[PDB]
């Protein structure tokens, strides 16, 4: 997308990571598996939730119609009334649709951005111990296992 990750340098999503939005898929002698990344997936969940709330709250102080009647010789003020009620309705309807649209676009980019940064926090982490495959994966040189994998995820990788 806008950041290149989702549906990009990383061709597809993992149909098997029910755990969260973003995560890992390690592979070594011991075995392979998916595991979501709590820190980011959650920080995202928090961020998106608020947006929903903000959108809802920004739209709660909008217009409201009130019924009035007019006689046969009050057609101008009656039309004036109708013009006005349709006007605010169209104005607020426009606001709800456009806001939803603009923000939805940003939501998809927020996730993409979220993935590129998670991916980066790992690229710049494995430094010279693994090789960047350019498919969203990192293949080390000298064997690494589960106690080692859980290092990268632990954010406490490198004997440094």
């Amino acid at each position: 997308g806008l950041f290149g990750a989702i549906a990009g340098f990383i061709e597809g999503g993992w149909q098997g990571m029910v755990d969260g939005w973003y995560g890992y898929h390690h592979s070594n002698e011991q075995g392979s598996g998916y595991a979501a990344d709590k820190e980011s997936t959650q920080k995202a969940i928090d961020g998106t939730t608020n947006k929903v709330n903000s959108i809802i709250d920004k739209m709660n102080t909008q217009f409201e119609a009130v019924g009035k009647e007019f006689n046969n010789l009050e057609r101008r003020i009656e039309n004036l009334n109708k013009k006005m009620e349709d006007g605010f309705l169209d104005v607020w309807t426009y606001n709800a649709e456009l806001l939803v649209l603009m923000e939805n676009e940003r939501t998809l980019d927020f996730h993409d951005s979220n993935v590129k940064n998670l991916y980066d926090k790992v690229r710049l982490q494995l430094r010279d111990n693994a090789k960047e495959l350019g498919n969203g994966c990192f293949e080390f040189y000298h064997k690494c296992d589960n106690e080692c994998m859980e290092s990268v995820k632990n954010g406490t990788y490198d004997y440094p």
């Binding site: 997308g1 990750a5 989702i6 549906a7 990383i10 597809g12 999503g13 993992w14 149909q15 990571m17 029910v18 939005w21 973003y22 995560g23 890992y24 898929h25 390690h26 592979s27 070594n28 002698e29 998916y34 998106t48 929903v52 959108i55 809802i56 739209m59 709660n60 909008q62 409201e64 009130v66 019924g67 009035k68 009647e69 007019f70 006689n71 009620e85 309705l89 607020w92 309807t93 709800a96 649709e97 939803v100 649209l101 603009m102 923000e103 939805n104 676009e105 939501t107 998809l108 996730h111 993409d112 993935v115 991916y119 693994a130 495959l133 969203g136 994966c137 990192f138 080390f140 064997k143």
Partner: protein
């Protein structure tokens, strides 16, 4: 040996829209547009509405005989009136500032009926013959129940002088009228005096009405017409009526209870024996959605109305196989 960075994916079929691309399939999405109602006119928070059915606000307030169902209506939440009630002014005529009175109804939740002038008080006038075939009741000629069509007595219409002080705490909605006969001959057959008037005075009201005669086509069989007036009498103010003929005096009036917060609804529905927090002319709404597209004229705790057909916010990310 390797570690791969990635993102969630599922069988989600959900679709959102964006400025550049429509129908993006996404893992998770939240709808925020409520599109259903229950098709009924319910009680609003335990309070039942005033459903006028075939009677208009006028038929109700003036006491059209076909509307005895609303002779003494209780506290209401909102009011529903059909588009063209068939029972309004049984005796043809007009109702001054009728729309302003209806709008007034919207600042109130109760009109309590009270007798400010007994029908027996007319010792010098005929308060018994003011009935017309245009106002049928029990197969006989009747008339609006809340007012009285006074008629000359013993071939005399002695000048009337009545005063009523609002000793109530509430504002008083007082309705009266004048009769516009078909011709000079009818004028005398009914009231005896040829040149008449109905003068009304309060602290704010100054008014003299003269019957305007003309020849008009028959409505509900009558070529005559009636003009109805209304004024709000403040507590402690007084109202003075003086007339030498054609006066449609008030009998009942209404104490305005401003629990205020109603407004008139237009619908052909009847009462649906249900309760709701949010009501529209088409039915009620029980929703947690921030928006709805049912109808603009709503009442109670409702979601915000918009013309949208669809309104879905992306929550998850793009769903890619």
């Amino acid at each position: 040996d390797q570690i791969c960075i990635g993102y969630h994916a599922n069988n989600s079929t959900e679709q959102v829209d964006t400025i550049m691309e429509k129908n993006v399939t996404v893992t998770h999405a939240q709808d925020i547009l409520e599109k259903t109602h229950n098709g009924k006119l319910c009680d609003l928070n335990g309070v039942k509405p005033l459903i006028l059915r075939d009677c208009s606000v006028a038929g109700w307030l003036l006491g059209n005989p076909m509307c005895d169902e609303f002779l003494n209506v209780p506290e209401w939440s909102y009011i529903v009136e059909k588009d063209n009630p068939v029972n309004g002014l049984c005796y043809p005529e007009n109702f001054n500032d009728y729309e302003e009175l209806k709008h007034l109804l919207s600042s109130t939740n109760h009109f309590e009926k009270i007798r400010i002038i007994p029908r027996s008080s007319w010792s010098n006038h005929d308060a018994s013959s003011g009935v017309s075939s245009a106002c049928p009741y029990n197969g006989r000629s009747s008339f609006f129940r809340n007012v009285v069509w006074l008629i000359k007595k013993n071939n005399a219409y002695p000048t009337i002088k009545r005063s009523y002080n609002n000793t109530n705490q509430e504002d008083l909605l007082i309705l009266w009228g004048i009769h516009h006969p078909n011709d000079a001959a009818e004028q005398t057959k009914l009231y005896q005096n040829p040149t008449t008037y109905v003068s009304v005075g309060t602290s704010t009201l100054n008014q003299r009405s003269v019957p305007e005669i003309a020849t008009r086509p028959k409505v509900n069989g009558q070529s005559g017409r009636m003009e109805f007036f209304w004024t709000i009498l403040k507590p402690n103010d007084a109202i003075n009526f003086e007339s030498n003929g054609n006066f449609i005096a008030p009998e009942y009036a209404y104490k305005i209870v401003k629990k205020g917060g109603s407004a008139i609804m237009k619908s052909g529905l009847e009462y649906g024996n249900c309760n709701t927090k949010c009501q529209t002319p088409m039915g009620a709404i029980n929703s947690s959605m921030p928006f709805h597209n049912i109808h603009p004229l709503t009442i109670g705790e409702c979601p915000k109305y918009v013309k949208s057909g669809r309104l879905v916010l992306a929550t998850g990310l793009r769903n890619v196989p």
